[PDB]
Structure 1
Amino acid sequence: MRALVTGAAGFIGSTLVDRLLADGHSVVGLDNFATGRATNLEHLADNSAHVFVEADIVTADLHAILEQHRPEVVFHLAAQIDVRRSVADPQFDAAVNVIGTVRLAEAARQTGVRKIVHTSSGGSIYGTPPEYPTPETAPTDPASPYAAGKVAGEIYLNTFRHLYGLDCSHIAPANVYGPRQDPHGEAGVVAIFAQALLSGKPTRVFGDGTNTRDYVFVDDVVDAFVRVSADVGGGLRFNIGTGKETSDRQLHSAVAAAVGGPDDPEFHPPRLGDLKRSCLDIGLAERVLGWRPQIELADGVRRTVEYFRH
């Protein structure tokens, strides 16, 4: 296929690019380096099947870009990804995550694109749900601007599906981790911990450390994107996770055991906008797509740490 990946310079995006190239596709990567890194893509300098476009989804001529490259599938991973930043500046988050997605859809529907694979946020869109693990049938109830924008993005793509037959599916991952996740942010706890613990720098958990997330390895998530790119699951969201809860404190212990050295995080005040629990029911992805996660947390943590050691 001819693929285009927005957010290609990012953690998941760069990993998806690699997988798509490995499967023999041609890939256009698109990014503005808001949070992405050139180092994530530098190994591709001499890869014959990849081309990079530096562009802001909010302001670039996406019509002209899509007209030139004519991708069959757009994997839409460009976004403002930090929940706390979305609280600090909800307008900016909405511009990137809602307006950006709208502009992309409007360009795609005019340029013969078959399908947009959206990245929603399985970990946050349900807010405090009726049950854990949470199925896609549960109502969305976002409690951060980030979560709200991801839902809105789903709704807009569904609308473009009705209007124009521009197909879409929503990949809704839980908490993604693994190599290339930026170690120097406030989001990406696994990378934050690994980097800090390897460097002997201080680490922290928030509140009482009991918050849970569902940690799913990047390679597994990438496989979900590939499967859903076909003519399957039009208009549908798929939760992509493990269906297992790990507390902040337990996560810290796992990373420290992998690094070696102390397991003694500081405790900081709770962060407004952060949910207490997150756990995804992944039955739908299993049946429809034949998707199952391969990498258990212990294995994933080892691989991640080992990646940061070098």
Structure 2
Amino acid sequence: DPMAEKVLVTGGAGYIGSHTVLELLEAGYLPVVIDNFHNAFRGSLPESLRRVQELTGRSVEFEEMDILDQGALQRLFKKYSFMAVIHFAGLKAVGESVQKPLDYYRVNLTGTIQLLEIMKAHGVKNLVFSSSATVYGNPQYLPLDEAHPTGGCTNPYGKSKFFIEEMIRDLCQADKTWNAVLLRYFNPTGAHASGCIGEDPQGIPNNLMPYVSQVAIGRREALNVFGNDYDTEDGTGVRDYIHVVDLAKGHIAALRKLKEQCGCRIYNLGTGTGYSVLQMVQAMEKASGKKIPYKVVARREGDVAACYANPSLAQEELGWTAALGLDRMCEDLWRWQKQNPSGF
């Protein structure tokens, strides 16, 4: 029966993936997760997923494997009957990608190509790709909508995400039976409201929310603020943050869209309101009850004043809206950090 078929979640042990697994379970889907533990903590599940099982009271099927392992992909697609794939597996630290680009291109490009090939072979032509709004590059107008130019980005991670988008678009053009939804978003933050799962400490973080929470808890003295004279409401730079639970629900919405036999579709996910650095400091002070000192330092050459996405098309075509604002992001991040100071 179609509703007894499974959803494959690649990279499902990680931050966004584990929250998406929880939302899938809560929504009545049956997830199968694959992950190679490159960036996830190790019972017989990844800890994140062990905790998702406890939070939901429902079972998570899991296989430890690498998307680069063709034989493992073949065994997986023979063992399970997948209705669709939600693809999070990849390398994603922007700063790391500059130092080890070939790893990024190998995992992200070759891994995705191998996934697409096994999906094609097994007739599972239904993909949710977790993309990045960095594909828009520097804003030419704001808010960024799906018509904005893509391909500007100069770091290897962002390029890899753009290249994957293009490969999927070209695949869909060549085979109209494929359905794919590409979800573009900026910085995921927050955590499940239980505080029992969240983002494990990362080696090279992509955004400042972990740093602000670490100043608040006392592990760092102050937040450096790069520039306070931007043409913004408060002079600090404005960036786009989405609560991981809203993000995860957007991935479920994309999964539903595949059933419409939509072909290739592209949607921004976000709240539609950018946040300044000072607004984020102030929100985390309110959530944590602690002073968060900052230090204004010089602008970094190349940083833009403001960057955020227009999520209107997702509301119109996925029925999706973000329900969780900056205060909830801060409150939920703070709870996860307080309950799990070194993560899992």
Taking structure 1 as reference, are residues 270 and 10 closer, same or farther at Cα in structure 2, changes over 3 Å only? farther
| Secondary structure in 2 matching 1:118 | strand
TM superposition shift of 1:70: 2.4
Taking structure 1 as reference, are residues 99 and 203 closer, same or farther at Cα in structure 2, changes over 3 Å only? farther
Q: Which moved more, 1:65-74 or 1:159-168?
A: 159-168
**Residue in structure 2 matched with residue 142 of structure 1 by the alignment:** 153
Deviations 1:134-160 (A, max 9, x none): 100011022221111111111111223
Equivalent of 1:220 in 222, 225, 246: 246
Equivalent of 2:78 in 61, 64, 67: 67
Taking structure 1 as reference, are residues 57 and 295 closer, same or farther at Cα in structure 2, changes over 3 Å only? same
Whether contact under 8 Å (1:125, 1:142) holds in the other structure is: yes
Check if 1:117 corresponds to 2:117.
Answer: no
TM superposition shift of 1:125: 1.0
Q: Which moved more, 1:1-10 or 1:50-59?
A: 50-59
**Residue in structure 2 matched with residue 22 of structure 1 by the alignment:** 26
**Residue in structure 2 matched with residue 289 of structure 1 by the alignment:** 318
**Residue in structure 2 matched with residue 11 of structure 1 by the alignment:** 15
Q: Which moved more, 1:290-299 or 1:179-188?
A: 179-188
Deviations 1:65-106 (A, max 9, x none): 122212111000112111111111221111122211111101
Structure-1 separation of matches of 2:313 and 2:53 = 38
**Residue in structure 2 matched with residue 202 of structure 1 by the alignment:** 221
Structure-2 separation of matches of 1:45 and 1:260 = 32
Taking structure 1 as reference, are residues 263 and 103 closer, same or farther at Cα in structure 2, changes over 3 Å only? same
Taking structure 1 as reference, are residues 274 and 107 closer, same or farther at Cα in structure 2, changes over 3 Å only? farther
Equivalent of 1:93 in 104, 107, 116: 104
Deviations 1:122-143 (A, max 9, x none): 2x11111221111000110222
**Residue in structure 2 matched with residue 171 of structure 1 by the alignment:** 183
Matched letter for residue 11 of structure 2: G
Give ranges in structure 1 of 5+ residues lacking alignment.
none
**Residue in structure 1 matched with residue 68 of structure 2 by the alignment:** 58
TM superposition shift of 1:184: 4.1
Whether contact under 8 Å (1:31, 1:53) holds in the other structure is: yes
Coordinate RMSD, CA, aligned: 2.3
TM superposition shift of 1:48: 5.4
Taking structure 1 as reference, are residues 101 and 202 closer, same or farther at Cα in structure 2, changes over 3 Å only? farther
Structure-2 separation of matches of 1:276 and 1:76 = 31
Please say which structure displays the higher CA radius of gyration. 2
TM superposition shift of 1:117: 0.3
Deviations 1:9-47 (A, max 9, x none): 111100110111112221111111222233211225676
Whether contact under 8 Å (2:246, 2:324) holds in the other structure is: yes
**Residue in structure 1 matched with residue 143 of structure 2 by the alignment:** 133
The number of residue pairs the alignment matches comes to 309
**Residue in structure 2 matched with residue 181 of structure 1 by the alignment:** 199
Taking structure 1 as reference, are residues 192 and 181 closer, same or farther at Cα in structure 2, changes over 3 Å only? farther
Taking structure 1 as reference, are residues 203 and 182 closer, same or farther at Cα in structure 2, changes over 3 Å only? farther
Give ranges in structure 2 of 5+ residues lacking alignment.
192-197, 229-235, 340-344
TM normalised by structure 2 equals 0.82
Whether contact under 8 Å (1:221, 1:240) holds in the other structure is: yes
Structure-2 separation of matches of 1:148 and 1:270 = 24
TM superposition shift of 1:118: 0.2
Equivalent of 1:252 in 261, 270, 281: 281
